[PDB]
């Protein structure tokens, strides 16, 4: 199989920027290369074929060039809609194969998370379970730490963290943290704390509730 | 233009067969082009599986050849994927796709999970003192959360697997002249036909 090496894997850039994405094939592919765009919502679109030709309704911001084994996609004057994942594809040889992809993300100012703690539902405490939830919302950059404390004691086990992709509205990230314990273990303690550490605020942002 | 849409089951058990339909509108599949199945694995890796041509000639990826058949129904303007002897490794989002001048037209894609685990509905729990809703213990992947009849535009956090069941959550942010105003999340799970309600 022909290997497609796509570069870079990720890009943090601004609106109005011109960016290039490259693809190297493990042999000459004679311009038999396409470029694909996949936006948030997981929808794919063909942008380019034969290395340079535009598919229908693709704006002239998108251009392509290359030959042999080395090809480029260029996007001039980036617009909001252009922030997506991009993929090369060769159809010179069966089986057709794809590059690893390039994620285009919006550069933004640094932002501190808004932190939100929630106790287990009575509903869940009836079933024998206890989940404590912490939302950490609208921060930049994506790198964030959350620490759970139960009566002051750090708990690493039983925690599930989930990040959103970059916000379509304000270019931020958000993460949800869930600590799950048994009803019996939950009722043996009073204080439940989530602490958020980010490259923005000196001290962590501490949110807690006491069962009293 | 051409419009394509995948349909078929969300969950296939290992060793059994994955079967998907692509319904094509706006253009006849006998007229031109190749009519493809491409899949995307959980880590974003794409793989070309095969096609059937406008003339009914098939090409398959050598990695799949013995395990795959792509067929068509020209009266209904549909083409079909069958992948047999499936393993957990066949878990992916499946796309039907037109190849002509590159790959212009793509279906929306459909997720197929290959697993021996049993189908389970979610146990939606409320999340009040920004607000939220916590959706726990469902299988397979298949939930959508909607806040105040689409009035709230709100974070959707992707599912994680705990104890072979999935858990996800959702958050809404409103000015403190509201929750005052009522706030309800509508939680829909197609593979259960349950719109597990809740609700304050």
């Amino acid at each position: 199989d022909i290997l497609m090496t796509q570069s870079p894997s990720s890009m943090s850039v601004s609106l109005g920027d011109t960016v290039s994405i490259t693809c190297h094939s493990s042999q000459d592919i004679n311009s038999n290369i396409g470029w694909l765009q996949q936006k948030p919502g997981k929808s794919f679109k063909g942008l380019i074929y034969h290395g340079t030709n535009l598919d229908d309704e693709v704006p002239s911001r998108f251009s392509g060039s290359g030959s042999g084994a080395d090809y480029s996609l260029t996007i001039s004057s980036l617009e909001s809609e252009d922030f997506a994942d991009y993929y090369c594809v060769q159809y010179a040889q069966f089986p057709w194969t794809f590059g690893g992809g390039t994620k285009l993300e919006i550069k933004r100012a640094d932002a501190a998370p808004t932190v939100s703690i929630f106790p287990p539902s009575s509903e869940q405490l009836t079933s024998g379970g206890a989940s404590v939830v912490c939302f950490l919302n609208n921060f930049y950059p994506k790198d964030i730490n959350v620490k759970w404390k139960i009566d002051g004691s750090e708990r690493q086990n039983g925690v599930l963290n989930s990040w959103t992709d970059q916000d379509s509205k304000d270019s931020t990230y958000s993460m949800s943290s869930t600590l799950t314990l048994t009803k019996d273990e939950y009722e043996r303690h009073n204080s439940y704390t989530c602490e958020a550490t980010h490259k923005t605020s000196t001290s962590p942002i501490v949110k807690s509730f006491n069962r009293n | 233009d051409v419009q394509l849409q995948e349909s078929g089951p969300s969950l296939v058990k290992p060793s059994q067969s994955l079967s998907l339909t692509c319904t094509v509108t706006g253009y006849s599949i006998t007229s031109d082009f190749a009519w493809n199945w491409i899949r995307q694995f959980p880590g974003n890796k794409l793989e070309w599986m095969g096609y059937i041509s406008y003339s009914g000639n098939t090409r398959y990826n050598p990695s799949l050849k013995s395990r795959i058949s792509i067929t068509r129904d020209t009266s209904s303007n549909q083409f079909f994927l069958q992948l047999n002897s499936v393993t957990i490794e066949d878990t992916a989002t499946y796309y039907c796709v037109t190849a002509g001048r590159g790959f212009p037209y793509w279906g929306q894609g459909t997720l197929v999970t290959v697993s021996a685990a049993k189908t389970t509905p979610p146990s939606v729990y409320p999340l009040a003192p920004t607000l939220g809703c916590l959706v726990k213990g469902y299988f397979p992947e298949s939930v959508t959360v909607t806040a105040n009849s689409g009035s709230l535009s709100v974070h959707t956090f992707p599912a994680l697997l705990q104890s072979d069941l999935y858990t996800m959550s959702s958050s809404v942010t409103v000015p403190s002249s509201t929750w005052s105003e009522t706030v309800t999340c509508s939680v829909a799970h197609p593979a259960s036909s349950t719109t597990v309600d809740k609700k304050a």
Binding site: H50, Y91 | F33, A34, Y51, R59, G100
Partner: peptide
């Protein structure tokens, strides 16, 4: 297209 000015089709797919 490609090295030359020739374009061709195979099974309805255009190639250089």
């Amino acid at each position: 297209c490609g090295a030359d000015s020739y374009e061709m089709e195979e099974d309805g797919v255009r190639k250089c």
